[PDB]
Amino acid sequence: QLQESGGGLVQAGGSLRLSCAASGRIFSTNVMGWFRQAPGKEREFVATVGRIGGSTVYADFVKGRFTLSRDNAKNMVYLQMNSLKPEDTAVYYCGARIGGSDRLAPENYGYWGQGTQVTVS
Amino acid sequence: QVQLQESGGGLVQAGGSLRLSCAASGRIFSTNVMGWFRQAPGKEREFVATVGRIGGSTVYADFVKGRFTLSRDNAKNMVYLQMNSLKPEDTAVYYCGARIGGSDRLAPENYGYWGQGTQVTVSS
Amino acid sequence: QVQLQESGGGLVQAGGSLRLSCAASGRIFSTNVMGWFRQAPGKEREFVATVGRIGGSTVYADFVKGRFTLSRDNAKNMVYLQMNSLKPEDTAVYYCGARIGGSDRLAPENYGYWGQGTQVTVSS
Amino acid sequence: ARPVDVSVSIFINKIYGVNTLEQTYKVDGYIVAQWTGKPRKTPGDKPLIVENTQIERWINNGLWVPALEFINVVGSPDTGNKRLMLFPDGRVIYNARFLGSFSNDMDFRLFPFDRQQFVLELEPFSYNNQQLRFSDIQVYTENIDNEEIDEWWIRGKASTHISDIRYDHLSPNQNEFSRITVRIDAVRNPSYYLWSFILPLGLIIAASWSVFWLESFSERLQTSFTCMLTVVAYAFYTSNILPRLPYTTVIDQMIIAGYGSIFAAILLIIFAHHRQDDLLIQRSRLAFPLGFLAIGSVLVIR
Amino acid sequence: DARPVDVSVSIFINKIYGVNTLEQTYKVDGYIVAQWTGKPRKTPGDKPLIVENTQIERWINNGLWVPALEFINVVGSPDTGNKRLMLFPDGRVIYNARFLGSFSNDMDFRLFPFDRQQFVLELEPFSYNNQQLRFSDIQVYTENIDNEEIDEWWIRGKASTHISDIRYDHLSSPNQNEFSRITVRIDAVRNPSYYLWSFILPLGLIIAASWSVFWLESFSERLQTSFTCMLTVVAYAFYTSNILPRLPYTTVIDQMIIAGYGSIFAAILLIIFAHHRDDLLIQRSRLAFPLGFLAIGSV
Ligand code: NA
């Protein structure tokens, strides 16, 4: 089970810190990734950890504005989102990679959370 | 298994245009195996066009010289041969065949389930 | 079970020409195994000519020097040796052999079913 | 200064040579990379083609040609013909044929019904996304006549992604690289494994239940060893053909269930011969079949 | 303005071997010859000039045009041995090179050991469309075979050739998106003698021998010899699996192995059913069981 939080309304240019609590059989937070889905559009990748140590994979629209971090102690990941713009308005979901061979593919993620709404004017 | 029916040919003046169509029906899950052939009285059945191995490519006989185009409609299981700048030498009955096996897209031997054919005549 | 029969030999003057024939009969699947040899009085039977491994090639002894030419008629199971510019050194019995096996078509030991041979005498 | 926009096209001719143990596969194809440099003068003001060894002479003279690395290639790829096409307007097209061994995560636990995702990951070796960024990617694959003769069944058109990899060990905004990702989905052709492996195994395991129809404790126990020995004889038939893996597959679990079923019968047969002449429990000619299928369904819960 | 350069090609195939059934590849050793006419040039003594191996590079650097020809269906870079340019004063240029490469082609081994294959070679310029370079003709020369009893494959017919044009949709960047292609094809059939005498014949005697269980007179004998037979097919299936090629589908021999399993299994059922329903009457299926097997075999 996964639960998101930290969404809300923010002014264009502001910041938000999304949080994803993980519970259950999850040896490490590496398997977790962030996604977003706007009304009518498809669920698109946002961020997850890179294969090799020190690397992180971000969607092309991030452009250095977001930053994925992890708190293995609390078994969590955070998406620090800055310089937000109206294009970023969507429901942000937190997923857990359940195999496959594509970190950026929603098809390879299960245990999705309810999602947390992010709205930018 | 399958059956093929040509259509779209007729009489046209040198330089005109025709569009041949071939409709397939039966145990066929792709139109990639279909190929156009022609055969005028006096000569042997010679290859004209079919799909290439890699996506986006198409194989044409040396006598096409870019004048004929093979298009596809996988949804309707139909192939089309747009023939332009027609010459009097293009006169023949154009056949539509389905590839049975082998590994030579150009050899008619590897094609079966031939159709009745459509006559294509080009005058001056 | 193979039988070989030579012919075409005879008397000729220096610089003349002969055309030798060899007819094969029995369990033979091709004329490629056939090869010409010659043996002089008190000399070891030496290689002359036979087909090459790759199509269009032919093996000739060093003393041929472009003078002889090996051709064949597979349909009739026959090979021919055209001998031009004959010299007294070419006097010998010319034998027709079939290549049993091995991997050295220049070695008489890899040939069998030898024929009776045809005499070639170059007078001078 | 803005980064160079590099457009990429990957043509995949063949994917084959899966190494289950190493989780690798071979990919033959072409890679095309196009970008726009500064205008230049060419013979007859027409496009100029430069092939193979001659490329090196333009690079030594200043022509910028960035190295694009296959992130997931094992060893140096086998690069064949390669050319440049230099347009007078500045456009540059780099084209090369490659054969490479590529790796990715591959799970064969549902063999012979497993499903794999063949991946190519491409990234500039030295230029970050402030200097070189992939603007787009297109993939072209083989037009299949019929897949009944093929080992893998392709499912869907190639999937693509363009993302940014951020490296924490390069220390301002100069530690992000542009990465292309291509994915080909495929399912294993199971026909052979169904008919020549799974089916004969079911017959062997089922035929071991025949011992219960023998009318002598001597016959039943002795024949149980011939069955145990048949499962072993079948074990090295599967081991000699099925891929080498560091874990058990479906077939493997069947084989293990077979060992237990026969070993169970040995105990029951002995248990029946000393419990009270218990031909009633020897009538477990239906219990054993039922118990196996029950546990068998649970085995394939993955 | 200028017409395409006409290139005449000749291919000498020394050996097709090393078939890999699962990879659908095969090895080809041979020569490639490519001839075209360039700008007339001076040559020492006005005789043809010969340039070999590393020296060829110096001539390309000095402006000599030598287009790269690619084997479309070669897997990996081919192993090129000696290579040669022959330059004539009238302009003719003849490129010659030895090659060994692994080639791919659609190969169907479903009728093994009675399968027929078409080994092909596909030649196409790597960079020049058919407005700059076209193939004028293709000649193919193959090996002269003595006796094919020792050869794994039996060649049938003369090598077929094709010259065609390949049009690429992705090259719309006026009318230069077409490439000339040569195609060679070698038709061959497999030599099945080995597989008939060492694989299909013994497997027949084993499947047949299993049918003699219906001639044992006690029920405990019929069922126990059936396991000996079952174990013989298992041992035999493994003998075959260790020699016959790896494929993603069953072959004739595999279906025979499978039929051996089904026959023995069905017999094991008939032996028990006949016992509990000591009926030696149906045990007289000594002729019924083999016929029913052959009847189903056709289907
Ligand atoms: Na025994």
> What would the two tokens of residue C34 be?
């056939």
E139: enclosing H helix or E strand: strand E133-141
C54 and E144: CB-CB below 8 Å?
A: yes
Write out chain C residues lying below 8 Å of E14, CB-based: 53-54
Neighbours of D299 (CB within 10 A): 12
Angle ∠(D92,D98,D103) on CA atoms, nearest 5: 120
Please say whether the beta carbons of B18 and B9 come within 8 A: yes
Chains B and D touch (3+ CB pairs under 8 A): yes
The secondary structure of chain A in percent helix, strand, coil, rounded to multiples of 5, reads 5, 50, 45
How far is residue E167's CA from residue E180's CA, in Å, rounded to a whole number? 9
How far is residue D153's CA from residue D190's CA, in Å, rounded to a whole number? 10
How far is residue C59's CA from residue D43's CA, in Å, rounded to a whole number? 50
> What would the two tokens of residue D116 be?
């794999």
Which residues 49-88 of D are in CB contact (within 8 Å) with E?
49, 51-54, 57, 78-81, 83, 85
Upstream peptide bond of D112 is cis (omega within 30 degrees of 0): yes
DSSP calls for E159-203: PEEEEEEEEEGGG------EEEEEEEEEEEEE--HHHIIIIIHHH
Q: Which of A118, A83, A79 is nearest to A95 (CA)?
A: A79
C14: CA distance to ligand 1 center in Å? 85
How far is residue E136's CA from residue E7's CA, in Å, rounded to a whole number? 5
How far is residue D250's CA from residue D197's CA, in Å, rounded to a whole number? 11
Q: Does E115 touch chain D (CB under 8 A)?
A: no
> What would the two tokens of residue B16 be?
């005109």
Specify the pairing of strand A32-37 against strand A44-49: antiparallel
**E222 Cβ contact partners less than 8 Å away, ≥ 6 residues apart:** E213, E214, E216, E267, E271, E283
Map residue E262 onto helix, strand or coil: helix
Q: Which residues have a C–N gap over 2.5 Å right after them in chain C?
A: none
> What would the two tokens of residue D227 be?
């069955």
Please say whether the beta carbons of E21 and E245 come within 8 A: yes
E118 and B103: CB-CB below 8 Å?
A: yes
Please say whether the beta carbons of B71 and B30 come within 8 A: no
Burial class (CB in 10 A: 0-12, 13-18, 19+), E216: middle
How far is residue C32's CA from residue E58's CA, in Å, rounded to a whole number? 43
How far is residue E122's CA from residue E73's CA, in Å, rounded to a whole number? 6
E234: enclosing H helix or E strand: helix E219-241
How far is residue D144's CA from residue D277's CA, in Å, rounded to a whole number? 65
E166 and B61: CB-CB below 8 Å?
A: no
Dmax of chain B from CA atoms? 42
Please say whether the beta carbons of D162 and D136 come within 8 A: yes
Please say whether the beta carbons of D229 and E231 come within 8 A: yes
Q: Does B30 touch chain D (CB under 8 A)?
A: yes
Burial B66-85 (b: 16+ CB within 10 A, else e): eebbbebeeeebbbbbebee
Q: Does D171 touch chain A (CB under 8 A)?
A: no
Write out chain E residues lying below 8 Å of D99, CB-based: 75-77
| Residue E290 φ then ψ, to 5° | -65, -40
Taking the alpha carbons at both ends of chain C, their separation in whole angstroms is 40
Q: Which residues have a C–N gap over 2.5 Å right after them in chain E?
A: 173, 277
DSSP state of A87: G
**C113 Cβ contact partners less than 8 Å away, ≥ 6 residues apart:** C2, C3, C4, C26, C97, C98
Helical packing angle, D217-239 and E219-241, nearest 10°: 10
E272: enclosing H helix or E strand: helix E252-275
> What would the two tokens of residue D170 be?
């390069």
- Which of B1, B34, B53 should one mutate to test binding to chain D, selecting the residue with the greatest count of D CBs within 10 A? B53
How far is residue D18's CA from residue E255's CA, in Å, rounded to a whole number? 26
Write out chain A residues lying below 8 Å of D169, CB-based: 54
Please say whether the beta carbons of D4 and D27 come within 8 A: no
- The residues that bridge with B5 in the sheet, in sequence order, are B23
Specify the pairing of strand C111-112 against strand C46-51: unpaired
Please say whether the beta carbons of E64 and E92 come within 8 A: no
Burial class (CB in 10 A: 0-12, 13-18, 19+), D267: exposed
**Residues, chain A, total?**
121
- The residues that bridge with D179 in the sheet, in sequence order, are D163
DSSP calls for E38-92: -S----GGGSPEEEETTHHHHHHHTT-----EEETTBSS--EEEEEEEEE-TTSE
- Amino acid identity, position C97: G
- The residues that bridge with D68 in the sheet, in sequence order, are D124
- The residues that bridge with E163 in the sheet, in sequence order, are E182
D151 and E234: CB-CB below 8 Å?
A: no
- Amino acid identity, position D65: V
Map residue B48 onto helix, strand or coil: strand
Neighbours of E135 (CB within 10 A): 24
**D42 Cβ contact partners less than 8 Å away, ≥ 6 residues apart:** D48, D86, D87, D88
Q: Which of D151, D107, C87 is nearest to E109 (CA)?
A: D151
Q: Which of B54, C116, C20, A39 is nearest to E169 (CA)?
A: B54
> What would the two tokens of residue D94 be?
């780099």
- Which of C31, C32, C51, C54 should one mutate to test binding to chain E, selecting the residue with the greatest count of E CBs within 10 A? C54
How far is residue B18's CA from residue E5's CA, in Å, rounded to a whole number? 32
Q: Which of A6, A23, A24 is nearest to A15 (CA)?
A: A6
**Half-sphere exposure of E84 toward its Cβ, with a 13 Å CA cutoff?**
11
Specify the pairing of strand B118-123 against strand B11-13: parallel
> What would the two tokens of residue D224 be?
């149980």
- Amino acid identity, position B38: R
Q: Which residues have a C–N gap over 2.5 Å right after them in chain A?
A: none
Q: Which of B8, B14, B6 is nearest to B67 (CA)?
A: B14
A95: left (phi over 0), alpha (psi -120 to 50) or beta: beta
Angle ∠(D203,D204,D205) on CA atoms, nearest 5: 95
- Amino acid identity, position B39: Q
How far is residue C95's CA from residue C47's CA, in Å, rounded to a whole number? 10
D226: CA distance to ligand 1 center in Å? 6
Map residue E130 onto helix, strand or coil: coil
Which residues 57-96 of C are in CB contact (within 8 Å) with E?
none
> What would the two tokens of residue B22 be?
């071939």
| Residue E167 φ then ψ, to 5° | -110, 130
Specify the pairing of strand D4-19 against strand D132-140: parallel
DSSP calls for C47-87: EEEEE-SBTT-EEE-TTTTT-EEEEEEGGGTEEEEEE-S--
Neighbours of E154 (CB within 10 A): 15
E207: CA distance to ligand 1 center in Å? 19
- Amino acid identity, position E253: I
**Residues, chain B, total?**
124
DSSP calls for chain D: -PPEEEEEEEEEEEEEEEETTTTEEEEEEEEEEEEE------GGGS-EEEEGGGHHHHHHTT-----EEETTEEEEEEEEEEEEEE-TTSEEEEEEEEEEEEE-----TTTTS-EEEEEEEEEESS--TTTEEEEEEEEE-B--S-GGG-SEEE-SSPEEEEEEEEETT------EEEEEEEEEEEEE--HHHIIIIIHHHHHHHHHGGGGGG-SSHHHHHHHHHHHHHHHHHHHHHHHTTSPP-SS--HHHHHHHHHHHHHHHHHHHHHHHTT----TTGGG-TTHHHHHHHHHHHHHT--
> What would the two tokens of residue E4 be?
């395409």
Please say whether the beta carbons of C48 and C94 come within 8 A: yes
D207: CA distance to ligand 1 center in Å? 16
Q: Which of A67, A59, A110 is nearest to A87 (CA)?
A: A59
> What would the two tokens of residue E84 be?
């040669």
How far is residue D233's CA from residue D208's CA, in Å, rounded to a whole number? 14
D161 and A100: CB-CB below 8 Å?
A: no
> What would the two tokens of residue E144 be?
């002269």
Neighbours of A15 (CB within 10 A): 12
How far is residue D249's CA from residue D300's CA, in Å, rounded to a whole number? 10
Listed by start position, the domains of chain C span 1-124
Write out chain D residues lying below 8 Å of B99, CB-based: 145
Q: Which of D45, D142, D50 is nearest to D95 (CA)?
A: D50
Residue of C nearest to E141 (CA): C55
Please say whether the beta carbons of A76 and A29 come within 8 A: yes
Q: Which residue has the tokens 């294959």?
A: E117
How far is residue E38's CA from residue E51's CA, in Å, rounded to a whole number? 16
Q: Does D168 touch chain A (CB under 8 A)?
A: yes
D146 and B55: CB-CB below 8 Å?
A: no
Q: Does D202 touch chain E (CB under 8 A)?
A: no
CA distance A114 to chain D (A): 25
Specify the pairing of strand B57-61 against strand B46-51: antiparallel
B32 and D143: CB-CB below 8 Å?
A: yes
Please say whether the beta carbons of D96 and E77 come within 8 A: no
> What would the two tokens of residue C74 be?
């597979």
Q: Which residue has the tokens 């690069």?
A: D79
E26: CA distance to ligand 1 center in Å? 45
Helical packing angle, D199-207 and D217-239, nearest 10°: 160
Please say whether the beta carbons of A97 and A48 come within 8 A: yes
Nearest to D51 among E75, E127, E250 (CB): E127
| Residue D12 vs residues D23, D144, E101: alpha-carbon distances, Å | 19, 13, 19
Nearest to A60 among D104, D162, D168 (CB): D162
Upstream peptide bond of E113 is cis (omega within 30 degrees of 0): yes
D141 and B29: CB-CB below 8 Å?
A: no
How far is residue C99's CA from residue E253's CA, in Å, rounded to a whole number? 36
Burial class (CB in 10 A: 0-12, 13-18, 19+), D294: exposed
| Residue B86 vs residues B44, B91, E23: alpha-carbon distances, Å | 20, 9, 43
Q: Which residue has the tokens 């079949």?
A: D289
Please say whether the beta carbons of C77 and C25 come within 8 A: yes
Neighbours of E218 (CB within 10 A): 9
| Residue E257 φ then ψ, to 5° | -55, -45
Map residue B8 onto helix, strand or coil: coil
Q: Which of B22, B15, B43 is nearest to B98 (CA)?
A: B22
> What would the two tokens of residue E233 be?
């097919």
| Residue E26 vs residues A105, C43, E17, E80, E224: alpha-carbon distances, Å | 37, 47, 6, 17, 47
A45 and D117: CB-CB below 8 Å?
A: no
| Residue C120 vs residues C8, C10, C61, D6, E71: alpha-carbon distances, Å | 9, 5, 17, 78, 51
How far is residue B93's CA from residue D223's CA, in Å, rounded to a whole number? 71
Nearest to E257 among D196, D230, D233 (CB): D196
